[PDB]
DNA sequence: TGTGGAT
DNA sequence: GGTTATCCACA
DNA sequence: AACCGTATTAC
DNA sequence: GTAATAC
C-alpha cells in the first residue's frame, strides 16, 4: 500500500532498460506519459525516503518503498548482490530541482551506496537534471522551443530568433508535461545526466557517516566548516551529455544545499521578528489582501492559495497547518490569526479542512506589520520574480520570546518557550536604558516563561542558565487541587496542563496507570472539560493516600514534564544559540533600523509636500498671471518651462501647478496653507531630531513599546517556583 | 476505516441521552468540542448516506456507517428492533443549513422509516436547525451578538440603537465555533428542534417511495408537479423551542429543496452558453483575475481558492476536477482551460494536485466571456452578497453543442455529445436566415457529433431522432485497420476509440478475453501508445479469424459502444429535453440579447463622450468667464451648479470641465475635437441601427459567428456512417 | 459497469 | 499525495 | 475528509 | 514516541 507503484517497461532487456526513481506520484504521472515505454520503467517515490544509515534494520526491511526497490531491481540486497541479475542497466534518480529534491537525491544514494555498492561502483546509478527555465517568443508565430539550466545559458537566450519573449521558471517536474520532460530530462539523445562514481572509498564512506548517521555534532561541524551561510554558490556550468562525479562531492554539494536551506529558510525563526519564513508569508499575504482583524473573515482556502501562488512554493497542507497553529491559543501565547470554525483542540483532534474554516489577522499581528509600507524593512524577490516579499517584519513587539518557536532543522533544533508580553517589553525597555544590563537584573522584569497552557514552572536556576547560555532544563507540572466527595473520598482535579501536551493522550496514560494498578488507590479517571474550562478529575478509592498517588503520576506520566530550552535563531544569516541578551539587543537594533527608516521615509514625504505648499501659496498671489501664462503656453511641457523661467518655480512645483484640476481654484486660502506649512516644518523637526539623536530615537522606541504593552498586556498564566 | 467514528457520552442514561448525527467529521469535531459530554454522543457522517430503498440489502448490511449506526443505538433492525434497549431517547439529525444538508436529512429518514420505524412514530427522531445569520459587533464586552434562522428575523436585528453593526451569513457548521454551536443548536435550553412524526402511514409510504425508490418517472413527475422552478420558496417562520412536522412535509420540503437546487444549479448545463455553474464560475473567476491565454500561467491552487472564496461554496477537489476536465482535450472538443503539468491522460491516471499544476483560459474560452464588461448579461449576488457573478456568459460561440455536456441530476440526466465548431456555426447561421428551417436541412450543415477522441459514428436515423426529440441511440466504434506480420500473420491496429472510454481499462478487458480464451486467435495485446500517437496492436495467431475476433471485440468489449443522446438543459429555469432546433434558437435569441445589450452599452458610452466634447468646444468661447466663475465658486459641486445655471451645461459636461487639469488650457484645437464628434456620430448611427433594425442586428450576429468559425475551425475527427 | 459534480 | 465511501439517471 | 509513510533534533 | 514544517 504505502510504497509507490511500478509501471514496467514492455521489454525484458537488462542491457539498456532504465528505472526512473521519481519524486512523487504526480511527477510519476508525467514521467509515465512522456516516457519511451519499451525500455523505461517508472517507480514513484512517496516523499522522503527512509535513512538507511540512521534507522535500524528491521525498520529498513519493513520499509515498503525499499522492498519494492529491491524487488524491481531484481539483483538482491547488500550481502546477496549480483550485478548481472539486475533488470536495468541504469538506475536514474530524477527529482524536483528544489532543495528537498537534493535531500531525496541524498537519501537514496546512501541506501544504494550501503546496500548495493557494486551497482554504484560499476557506475549504474545516475541522476537526471531537469531544467530551471523555459523561453518562448511564439505560440501562433511558431513557438521557439528553448530551455536553460544556468543563469548563463539563460542570458544566452536573450538572442535566439525572437525577443520580448517569456521565461517560465520551473519549481517542479509537476509543472512539466510529457513532451517537456522527454526532450529535456528523459530522451537519451537530448537529456543530460550525471553518473555517480566512487573515487575514494575512504573519503566517500566518511562523508556519508558524518552527514547521514545519527552523530549530530560531526554533522553540525561539517555544516559549520563547509556551508557558507553568507554566500551564494555560483553553480556548475552543465557539461554536455553525461558527467562523472564522485559520490563524495555529490553527497556534499546536495546535503549542503538542503542543510543550508532548511536552516535559513524553513525550520528556524529569525531573531528579530520571531517568524519562520512560512509564517512571515502568511502574515504578509493576509495583510496585503486586507485580510485584517477589523474587516470580514475570509475563506481559508482563498488565503492559502494566494500565499502559495505569490510567496510560498510548497504544499497547501504545510501552509494550512502553519496558519492554523498561529490561531490556536494553547500553542501561541499571542495568536496572530483569528479563525472561525474548528481549529482543533487540546485533545489534538484534526482542525476542519481549509474548505470549511475562515480567517483573518489578529489585531496584534497588525503590529508585527505596522509601517511595512514605509520602506522600513528590506524586501526581496518572490520565487518567480513577479513580486517582492519582506525578509523580515517591522515587529513592534518582540515576537520571538512572546510566542516562542519550536522547530527542527539539519544540525540544529530550537525550543524557545512563550513569554508574557508585558514582562518581555519591560526587560527590553530596561535594556534600552542599560545596554550592559545583566541577567539577574533583567530577570526582575522577565522572571521566566509564561505558557498559554499555564501550569507550574519549576527551576529558577535552570531558567538562568537558559537565559545566559540558551540551554537549560526546567520543570512544568500541572495545576492540581483536592476536592472531597460523598463517602468522604477525595479526587484530584487538574485545571492547567504542560505546554505541548495532548490532553486526551494524557488522560489515557493516567487511566492506563489505574488499569495497571501501578499505584494503589485510583477508582475512575474522568475528563470533565466542557467548552469553558479544562477539568480532568482523578477519583480515588475510600482512603487512598492522596499524595502518594499524585507523586507516581507526576513522576511516571506527563502530568509533569521537563521543558528543555534550546534557543536557536537566525542572526546575520547564521544559526546561533542565544540567551536573553543577544535576543533583546538584536530586537532593539532592529526596531532602531525601523524607526530610523520610517522617519527618513515620512520626512522625505513631508518635505515634498512642503515644497509644494510653498509654491501653491506663491501661486495664489500671482494667480491671474499664472493662468494667463498657462493660456499663452503651447502644451504641458512648455507651460512648466515658462513657469520656471518667468517665476522660478521648481520642477516639482511646476508639475503640481500644471496638474491642478480647475475646481481647485475654489480653495485658495493662503492662511490655511500657511497653517499646513507650520505643521510640516514641525513634523520634519521631530523627524530630523529622531534621525539626529540616538537618545531621541531610543525614547520613542520606548514610548511605542509602552503603548503596545498597555494595549495588549495580560496577566501571567504560569506560576514560577524555585525548588526542583 | 470508512464509517464516521463514535464518541461516547459519559454516563449511560437512555432516559435523556442524545446521539447527534452530524454532517461530516470536520463539523463532528466542532460538535464534540461544543457538546455536553455527559448526555450527548457524537456519530459523524462521511457525507452521503446510502439510500435504503434504492440500495438493495446485503450491500446495506455491510455498509460500514449503517452497521455503526445500529450498533450504537443498541436495539436492532426493524422486526428485531426494540425501543426499550435503545441507548438514546433522542436521535438528533444535525446538518448544514445547505441543500445537501437537506439531501442527507432525506437519506437518513428513509433508514429510520424503513428499518427502525418505532423510533420515528414515538417522536425520538429530531432535526438539527443551525442558524443562517449572526448579527452585530460592539468591541469585546460585546453588547452585540444575536443570531437568525429566517429572513423575517433579520428586520428584527437591523433594529439596534448604535449603528449598522456587522452580519455573518453562515454557510454550514464548519464556520461555527463550539460556543456558537452549543448555544444555538445543541443546548436543550436554547436549541430549537423539529420533532419527526408519522401522521398517516399511507401518505408517507407513497411519499417516501416516490422520492427515493428506483422509478425515476414518478419522482420526475412529483417534481414536475410540486416544485416551482421560476418561483422562490421563502415561507416557514421560526416558532417556539420544539416544533412538529410529519415525515411527509419533511421528505417533501427537503427533497424538493434539494432537487430544485441540483437540477438548476449543479448538474445540468444552461442551454445558452452550455455551462454548468462551476464551469462558468471557473471561467468568470480566472477571467476577472486576468488569468487569460495571453498572460502567463498561474498556480492552480490560487485560481481554485479564489473561485471558492468568491463564487463556489463547495469542495476544492470538486472545483479542481471541473477545471482539469475543461483542459482535457479528449473530454472537450474545444478546451476552455490550458493547464501546464499532469492534467490526467486517456488511461485516466490521476492528474497532479492543484499545488503542482498551473493554468489559464484558452483563447477560445475568452470568446465565451467576450463583451461581459458591457452589461450584456444578468448578474446575481454571490453566495454572501460581497460580490456579483453572471447567471450566463455572452457565449460568442455555441458552446453547448460544441463541447457538449454529461451530467446526472435528480429525476433527470443529460448526455449531450460534442460537435464540430464550424458545422454548428454553419447551421446556426443558416437558421438565422431561416428560422423555420427543418432538421433535414440543418443536417446538411451539421450531420452528426464530432468527438475529440474521434472514432466512427454509425446511425443516420438515430442521429436524426436525437436531433428531433433529444433522444436516440447511436453506435460509436473504434477506428481500426489490419496490418500484416512476419510469416502469414495479422494484427488489429486500433488508432481511435470512443468518447469516455479509459484506454488502459479497455486494453485490460481485451487482454482478459485472450487469457480466458472467450474467442480464440489472440497472441498478445500491446498498448503501443506514446506521447505523439495512440496505437493499440492486437496481435493474432497464425490462421485465426480476424473477423470473428474483431466483431467479438466490438460486441463484448468497449472497442465499440452505444452513445445515448439524452439532451437535457435549463431553459427558462426549468429542465427541458431539447433537439437541435430549440437549442439553436435558444442561442440565437441569446446572441440577440447580447448584441443588443452590448450595442446600448457602447452607445451610452459614445453619447456621454460626444456630449462632453460638445461642452468642451463650447467652453473655449467663454474661457475667461468660466475661470472667473470657478474661482468665485465656494467649492467643486458649487462651481458645477454655477456652470449649469449660468451657461447651460449638463452635469456630465460640467463635471468634465471642472476636472480639467490647468495644462488643458494650452490646447485650443477645436478641429481634432470635431473629427472626434464626426467619428462618434457615425459610430452611434451604426449602433442605433443595430438596435432599431432586427435584420441589421442579425447580419452582425452572422458576421461575428463567421469570424469565430474562421478563427477556430478544425477538421471533423469522427467519420460518419448510416446503418450497420 | 461507469459517467461527473457533490458530500 | 494516494486510498477509501456515498448520491443521482441511465444504458 | 480520515489515514497512512518519511527526514530532521532532542529529550 | 512527540514536537512542526516539509515531501
Ligand atoms: N504520495 C505522496 N504523498 C506525500 N504526502 C504528502 C502529504 C501532505 O501534502 O501533507 C501528507 O500528509 C502525506 C501523508 C502520508 F501519510 C504519506 N504517506 C503514507 C505513505 O503511503 C506515504 C504521504 Cl506520501 C504524504 C508526498 F509528500 C509525496 C508523495 F508522492
Ligand atoms: N470524511 C468525509 N469525506 C468526504 N469525501 C470528500 C471527498 C472530496 O471532497 O474530494 C472525497 O474524495 C472522498 C472520498 C472518499 F472515498 C470518501 N469516503 C471513503 C469513506 O471513508 C467515505 C469521502 Cl467521505 C470523501 C465527504 F464528502 C464528507 C466527509 F465527512
Ligand atoms: Cl494639492
Ligand atoms: Cl478630455
Ligand atoms: Mg516541490
Ligand atoms: Mg498531511
Ligand atoms: Mg513525568
Ligand atoms: Mg455544505
Ligand atoms: Mg473527490
Ligand atoms: Mg460493446
Residue numbers in the entry:
A (entry chain B), B (entry chain A): 411 to 648, 1001 to 1486
Show sentences the authors wrote.
Fluoroquinolones stabilise this complex which cellular processes convert into a lethal lesion, likely a frank double-stranded DNA break.
The delafloxacin complex presents as a dimer with the two ParC55 breakage-reunion domains in a ‘closed’ conformation flanked by the two ParE30 metal binding TOPRIM domains, with a single DNA helix bound across the dimer interface. Protein binding induces a U-shaped bend in the DNA involving the symmetric minor groove intercalation of the two ParC I170 sidechains. A magnesium-chelated delafloxacin molecule is intercalated into the wedge-shaped space between the -1 and +1 nucleotides at each end of the 4-bp staggered DNA break site introduced into the 18-mer V-site duplex by nucleophilic attack of the two ParC Y118 residues. The 5′-phosphates at the ends of the DNA break are covalently linked to ParC Y118 residues confirming capture of the cleavage complex.
